[PDB]
Symmetry: C6
Subunit: 131 residues, 6 copies
């Protein structure tokens, strides 16, 4: 069916969090304009190693940076597609208010959507991060 | 035989649309001069990730673009070959008239025709799109 | 034996034409000086995708072209070797005379002869074609 | 569980040191500010071959160096993550004091953390080493 | 033993010539200073495709050439090693005298000697050939 | 154990020399300062093909050379590690004295030590050789 398949995939994946593994990271998005959208499972993510590159703002400049990216493997399709056009945060903290203080700032760099029941995406860290 | 094989392939593939998967996208072509040709199955398509490149209009210019392409896997051979020389639209909308208002503009970039009973093609998005 | 093997290979391959597949293309050569040599089987051929390159006449010029090539897989060794040094035509038309009007002009670019009983060759389209 | 799994992995790996193999090297870190953190198992490490490169301090200079790196395969996750942000020493010697005299100076270059129960890391030798 | 193994390999390979295949080419060398050394089996050889390169005499010149090479697979180790330092001829003709009139001129470009009982070598055609 | 394993590996490999194969080459080192260290087995070695490169003494000069390297596969770990920092000779001749007259001069270029019971190394020929 592909409709209940994504939801059952979320239910079966929710077993992974009951086992304490350190690869699990909390991902949040800001899909609506002002407030946040959180992925339900505390999914796992790997880190592709860094590469030393020029600035993406101006490539032919003295300022250079290291591009750091994260590889998120099992992320449900139930999340809105337009969420991927908005900045994402890995391990964020929410206060008493609706804002976030600390976390690791990332932007969706490349989408892999070959599997029909889950997305898989790589997201690049911002050049300036909070923590 | 290869004649009825393409038609039976269309009939068996028409099962995929009865199952609700999000990878299915509607493809239309404009093979005749003025009006449209629609592929029968609501086939699936993947997105190859973007690459930052110079302008194809003038390569050695300040203006740069991102080349975005789509990978259409199961497309029948029953479609006319000359349709591939005309612009294509992914998820288009047809009004009361014969024209299209909105959709994602693409052009056939590379043809893979190794299989004798279906085409497989990658089509590059236009630099300017409607939606 | 390798002598009757090529001829039996031609006989068994002649079954493929009795089945209507669209990958079959008629190849002709002009091996003797003035008249034509036609390969017996209506063999199949794939199209390797195009690449944008400079002119082979002068590489460091403003004029650029797209190199288009065809991959012919099952072609018998019974054809003369020296035929491969002459221009080839894919889907040609012969009139009442011995000349050809229309067809797709190609030249043998690379030979693969690893198999002892058939050639396999890739042939590059001419920069100027008839149809 | 993933909690006792890392500790049992340390216990089973502690068998490797009871067998005398020469690939085993002692790794120490300086995770707290001033004193040292030693990995429990005398784990094995391979040497990726050297490459001749420019200076990382100034790339477009006359001074060039050879980048030498070590590939540490089985290293437990029980070590603090922040230890990887501090210099590491391969085969170090500790005196009567808390300082180290001799050893091979290295810095964590790339982290591979695909396995959920062990890290695997490559660490680049410093340009100036003690021994 | 490796001594009789090469000779038995020559005897068993001598079956291939009794079967008429077109991949068989006669190779001769000029290992002694003035007269010729012929390999015993009429071994087979494939043609790696051509590449357009600058002149090896002067690389940064207007004169360019195409490097054409041949891949000789089954060649016995019984031939002297020093024969490979001398020019080789594919399909040569010997007259009534000890000289050769026609043939395809080649020089040993790269040696593959991984197998302990046969050589395998690629030999590059000379820029100027006889036929 | 890994201690007797290297010695038994030397004993079992000493069978290879009792069979006459031409890939066996005698390797000697000069690990102590003045006299020689010979590897016990007459191990086999392959030749990686040559590459045309600039001078390693000055890269941006008119003088160019061909880098020739040898791939030594089965070499025991019982040899001292510091031997690899000294020049090596393939097929050397020892006179009545402790010096060597003729042989093929090589230097350890890259070490592969993934296997815990044998080294495997590639060693580059010197630009000037004796024979």
């Amino acid at each position: 069916l592909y409709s209940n398949l994504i939801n059952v995939k979320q239910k079966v994946i929710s077993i992974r969090e009951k086992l304490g593994d350190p690869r699990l990271k909390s991902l949040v998005f800001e899909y609506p304009a002002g407030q946040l959208f959180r992925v339900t499972p505390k999914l796992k993510v790997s880190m592709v190693p860094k590469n030393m590159i020029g600035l993406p703002l101006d490539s032919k400049s003295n300022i250079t940076i290291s591009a750091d990216d994260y590889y998120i493997t099992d992320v449900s399709r139930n999340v809105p597609e337009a969420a991927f056009r908005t900045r994402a945060w890995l391990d964020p903290v929410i206060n008493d208010s609706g804002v976030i203080v600390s976390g690791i700032n990332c932007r969706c760099h490349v989408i892999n959507d070959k599997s029909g029941l889950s997305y898989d995406l790589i997201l690049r860290k911002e050049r300036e991060v909070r923590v």
